[PDB]
Amino acid sequence: DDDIAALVVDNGSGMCKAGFAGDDAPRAVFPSIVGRPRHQGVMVGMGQKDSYVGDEAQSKRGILTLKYPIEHGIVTNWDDMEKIWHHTFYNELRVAPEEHPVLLTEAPLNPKANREKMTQIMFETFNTPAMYVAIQAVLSLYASGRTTGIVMDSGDGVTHTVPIYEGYALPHAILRLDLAGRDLTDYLMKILTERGYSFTTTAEREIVRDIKEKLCYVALDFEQEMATAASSSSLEKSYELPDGQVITIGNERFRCPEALFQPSFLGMESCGIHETTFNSIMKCDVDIRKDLYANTVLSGGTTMYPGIADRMQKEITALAPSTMKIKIIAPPERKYSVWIGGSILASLSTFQQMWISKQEYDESGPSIVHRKCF
Amino acid sequence: SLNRRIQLVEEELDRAQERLATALQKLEEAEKAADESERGMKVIENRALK
Amino acid sequence: DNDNSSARLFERSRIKALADEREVVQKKTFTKWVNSHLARVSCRITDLYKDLRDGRMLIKLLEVLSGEMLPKPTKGKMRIHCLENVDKALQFLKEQRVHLENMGSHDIVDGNHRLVLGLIWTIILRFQIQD
Amino acid sequence: PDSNIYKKPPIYKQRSKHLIEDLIIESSKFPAAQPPDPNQPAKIETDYWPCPPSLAVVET
Ligand SMILES: Nc1ncnc2c1ncn2[C@@H]1O[C@H](COP(=O)(O)OP(=O)(O)O)[C@@H](O)[C@H]1O
């Protein structure tokens, strides 16, 4: 059959996912952090290890400083990204990178040097036979199974909305907002000071991120929820720190996700996500807005708070004309949907013609990616 | 020497007993969830057949 | 809530099942490959995770594959001596310029499945056998 | 990089008129004044050491 399954690697600001072409689910999922020791080593006889990558960095987070190589969808330290890719290929999947083609994902709007640098790294350091760069929001529409629709994708570093009609994308209506889960985590660290809890270092940022994943939700009405929380203490939850201490957040459960809809809490002039989606729909042509309203697709791990679908539907219905229906399509496994789309892209027969070969790279330099990728 | 040997075996026995207890509790929780699943199964079946 | 439960079901079933299926098959293959080379010294491993903890068997496997004389294993029964032996094996691997990432002595000693399997895979792929 | 550290000599290691006393000086170096038995195991691994061993050795 001579068909070799192509590795699909989804790289985000928060977590790295990796698997094979045609599989249902990724084989490896792990956080994208690189940690380094910050204290004296006195037990002579133990082994020395310069850096910690992935789950092992999270396991020993006490004695390490953790740094994210990718910030706001842009990778800043390339050596950490190379270490993460090496760990992915050799310790998570146990495959030879020179055997399989690799498919990579990136944000829609970004600096142009990122594509060239990943192309050069994948063609020189890892000796892959072919590679391709795709946009995550298109892969979400592949995972949905519908040809037309508007895709909003919010991850750990970037939020972006694209419209697509019958497989044709409108590049002038693509909108990018720099609001994501890391800013929400920082805001939760800020507003937890009011109750008396102080979190400063990076391990505390991981703890606050876990608290946000456990005990945050979106209120359908913000003022009603604020009045209810002020009236009684029924809307309170308790969390347990790793050292045994118990904290009670209470009112802060629905104030952190509200910054997604009102960015004035963070000092940003830019509008909310619902406003961005409505503006992206309104920037399209007149007679495709009917199809774009009924096919709104949510994606990314940031869209996993409870009550996002109902609140976004209510806000968009308030903005849109009342004569036609608006529904929000939120699959339960949306967090991995981008990767799933990539797998479908690696399974199509015509996509074997779309790979960037090594000979083509050798002829055209790192600039071939702008010509051969959207 | 025999004192330390008995110490090691006793510690391992206590650890094994703790693991057995938590495994039994997890099994009980799994059985309860399995019962709730078939409750939901017949109520959804009734709705669909109507 | 309910969507979180569905996502938990999806990950816990699919990702875990596919992952540990692949580790089981690759572990059996790697165990057979190691047992093929370790019969010269007449040493045999029954479990790949457990038998590589003390570091003696890794030293003997590198002894067979390289064909050279590694330094003395440290005479001991403790955790420190196991760390010392695994660190000696990793230093000999660094001598041959075999590139390992996220590889530490305490990771091999503590019995991490993924890192032990990755170390064996790097031994099979990158390291070359002298005859 | 690629430097092996264990097969280097010790750092302190890197730098007549009587026979009878020199052999006594040689014999005084060992923990007992006679050299130990070559096929006897050392005190570290003789299972008489007071400190507890690692989990892996006990498991095996
Ligand atoms: N169940 C959840 N509930 C609320 N927030 C979540 C949940 N899961 C993940 N997140 C947030 O989403 C982020 C992870 O998003 P992710 O999908 O990894 O983005 P990317 O893949 O683009 O890096 C985390 O920082 C976390 O704050």
Helices A202-215 and A181-191 cross at an angle (nearest 10°) of: 100
Longest dimension (CA), chain A: 75
d(CA C73, CA C84): 8
3-state secondary structure of D36: coil
Question: Token match 């308790």: residue?
Answer: A238
Q: Where are the alpha helices (DSSP H) in chain A?
A: 55-59, 78-87, 113-124, 136-144, 181-191, 202-215, 222-231, 258-261, 273-282, 289-293, 308-319, 337-345, 358-364, 368-372
CB neighbour class for A113 (10 Å; exposed up to 12, middle 13-18, buried from 19) = exposed
Q: Which residue of D has its CA nearest to C90?
A: D4
Question: Token match 């007549």: residue?
Answer: D16
Q: Is C82 on the interface with A (CB under 8 A)?
A: no
d(CA A313, CA B33): 33
Amino acid found at A270: S
Encoding tokens for residue B20?
């057995």
d(CA B46, CA C11): 30
CA distances from residue A266 to A184, A258, A270, A271 in whole angstroms, order as listed: 9, 10, 10, 11
The residues, any chain, with a CB within 8 Å of residue B46's CB and separated by 6 or more, are none
d(CA C47, CA C51): 6
d(CA C102, CA C106): 11
CA distances from residue A148 to A139, A164, A292, A297 in whole angstroms, order as listed: 12, 5, 7, 10
Q: Are A128 and A101 in contact (CB under 8 A)?
A: yes
Our answer on whether C and B touch (3+ beta-carbon pairs < 8 Å) is no
Rg for chain D, CA atoms, rounded: 19
* Buried/exposed B19-49: b ≥16 CB within 10 Å, e otherwise: eeeeeeeeeeeeeeeeeeeeeeeeeeeeeee
**Helix (H), strand (E) at residue A71:** strand A70-71
CA distances from residue D26 to A261, A331, A341, D9, D38 in whole angstroms, order as listed: 84, 81, 76, 21, 17
3-state secondary structure of A279: helix
Amino acid found at B38: E
d(CA A223, CA A229): 10
Among the listed residues A247, A47, A169, the one whose alpha carbon sits nearest the alpha carbon of residue C115:
A47
The CA distance from D17 to the nearest CA of chain B, in Å, is 49
d(CA A110, CA A13): 14
Phi/psi region, residue C55 (left: phi>0; alpha: psi -120 to 50; beta: rest), is left
The CA distance from C100 to the nearest CA of chain D, in Å, is 12
Half-sphere exposure for A232 (CA within 13 Å, toward CB)? 3
C-alpha A126 chain-centroid distance: 25
Residue of D6, D45, D59 lying closest to C71 (CB–CB)? D6
d(CA C31, CA C49): 10
Probe target for ligand 1 pocket from A335, A336, A337, A338, with the most ligand atoms within 8 Å of CB: A335
Please indicate whether, in this complex, the C-beta atoms of B1 and D47 are within 8 angstroms of each other.
yes
d(CA A55, CA D3): 29
> Cβ–Cβ contacts within 10 Å for residue A259, how many?
19
Q: What is the resolution of this structure in A?
A: 3.5
Our answer on whether A and B touch (3+ beta-carbon pairs < 8 Å) is no
> Cβ–Cβ contacts within 10 Å for residue C60, how many?
18
Q: Which residues of C touch A340 (CB under 8 A)?
A: none
Encoding tokens for residue A284?
């399209």
DSSP A46: B
Long-range contacts, stretch D1-8, CB < 8 angstroms, 24+ apart: D1/C94, D2/C94, D2/C95, D2/C97, D3/C94, D3/C95, D4/C91, D4/C92, D4/C94, D4/C95, D5/C91, D6/C71, D6/C88, D6/C91, D7/C71
Among the listed residues A217, A208, A311, the one whose alpha carbon sits nearest the alpha carbon of residue A255:
A217
d(CA C23, CA C73): 30
Q: Are A147 and A6 in contact (CB under 8 A)?
A: no
Q: Which residues of C touch D5 (CB under 8 A)?
A: 91
Question: Token match 């979106």: residue?
Answer: A218
C-alpha C80 chain-centroid distance: 18
Please indicate whether, in this complex, the C-beta atoms of D52 and B1 are within 8 angstroms of each other.
no
* Buried/exposed A127-152: b ≥16 CB within 10 Å, e otherwise: ebbbbbbbbbbbbbbbbbeeebbbbb
Q: Is D40 on the interface with C (CB under 8 A)?
A: no
C-alpha A244 chain-centroid distance: 31
C-alpha B44 chain-centroid distance: 28
DSSP A109: S
> Cβ–Cβ contacts within 10 Å for residue C4, how many?
13
Q: Is B1 on the interface with D (CB under 8 A)?
A: yes
Question: Token match 């968009």: residue?
Answer: A316
A305 lines ligand 1 (CB under 6 A): yes
CB neighbour class for D45 (10 Å; exposed up to 12, middle 13-18, buried from 19) = middle
Encoding tokens for residue A121?
């790294």
Longest dimension (CA), chain D: 56
End-to-end CA distance of chain A: 30
CB neighbour class for D8 (10 Å; exposed up to 12, middle 13-18, buried from 19) = exposed
Edge-to-edge strand list for the sheet holding A15-20: A28-31, A15-20, A7-11, A102-106, A130-135, A356-357
C-alpha A188 chain-centroid distance: 19
Our answer on whether B and D touch (3+ beta-carbon pairs < 8 Å) is yes
Approach to solving = cryo-EM
Encoding tokens for residue A307?
């009550």
Half-sphere exposure for A360 (CA within 13 Å, toward CB)? 17
Probe target for ligand 1 pocket from A212, A216, A339, with the most ligand atoms within 8 Å of CB: A212
Q: Are A281 and A293 in contact (CB under 8 A)?
A: yes
Q: Which residues of A touch C83 (CB under 8 A)?
A: 45-47
* Cα A16 to middle of ligand 1, angstroms: 11
CA distances from residue C19 to A11, A28, A342, B32 in whole angstroms, order as listed: 19, 7, 19, 28
A73 lines ligand 1 (CB under 6 A): no
* Cα A213 to middle of ligand 1, angstroms: 8
Counting as contact any 3 or more CB pairs under 8 A, the partners of A are C
d(CA B18, CA B14): 6
Q: Which atom of ligand 1 is nearest to the CA of A216?
A: 4
* Cα A156 to middle of ligand 1, angstroms: 6
The CA distance from C91 to the nearest CA of chain D, in Å, is 6
CA distances from residue D39 to A213, C81, C110, D35, D36 in whole angstroms, order as listed: 61, 21, 32, 12, 9
Q: Is C107 on the interface with A (CB under 8 A)?
A: yes
Read off φ and ψ for residue A232, nearest 5 degrees: -145, 165
Tell me the count of B-D CB pairs closer than 8 A. Answer: 7
Q: Which residues pair with residue A175 across a beta bridge?
A: A161
Interface of C with D in 64-93 (CB under 8 A): 71, 75-79, 81-82, 88, 91-92
d(CA A350, CA A132): 14
Helices A78-87 and A113-124 cross at an angle (nearest 10°) of: 50
d(CA A348, CA A355): 12
d(CA A218, CA A189): 18
Residue of D2, D7, D54 lying closest to C77 (CB–CB)? D54
d(CA A292, CA A282): 10
Read off φ and ψ for residue A130, nearest 5 degrees: -155, 160
3-state secondary structure of A212: helix
**Helix (H), strand (E) at residue B22:** helix B2-49
Q: Which residue of C has its CA nearest to D58?
A: C77
